[PDB]
Amino acid sequence: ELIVNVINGPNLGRLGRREPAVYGGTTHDELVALIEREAAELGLKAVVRQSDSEAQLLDWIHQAADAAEPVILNAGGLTHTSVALRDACAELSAPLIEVHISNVHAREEFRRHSYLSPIATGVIVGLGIQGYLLALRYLAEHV
Template identity: 40%
Template structure:
């Protein structure tokens, strides 16, 4: 069974706690459970979350070697707008990358409209809440 990697960046471990009006009331654990239940029997799901840019970069470098990985779904959070290191790490991957944002970053503050990774991604899913993760996993299943 192939593997889908779900990467979440800074502050996403505070889903259900931080800015509920924007990000919803489901916790990070609820998100993981929902994705795992949806993918059951189709994929192995591996989750990674960090508030530290370097840890995310290192993790991406490590999964590059994993031949079971069929794709990556990533919500880099605020690193979307600022991390050249994250962009460089993602550029080494040879599997599809699906970018997910719970909110529509194009309709938010001007600094959130800068996106350093979208051109590396096979698909971007924004503004669909946590359902965007499910859509990303489904897209990878259809593509592979």
């Protein structure tokens, strides 16, 4: 059985109950539930985790590197800013799928650049919360 780490970065704990015009009306706990529901359908286990702490994100990335498990990562603002987080992600031997809820190319110019994309397997942007469900489906087929 494949175990998949879903990791949300800064501010995404406020999903759904804040800024529904931007990031959608699904809350972080509902997101967790949808991911676990889809994982069961696919015969996988999803571990869904969110933190505002870069140190804490790096630790979760490290652990998935040690376990050789895949990661679906929405790093929030750290996508555009963190070399630390890119270098922890570059270490992963299993696939890394980068997810943005919003279309980061329809926004400010600075969101169009990701430290993560070049070292990710692939990227999904602007498809809302389905982004994560779709990433999980890719990883279920690419084992």
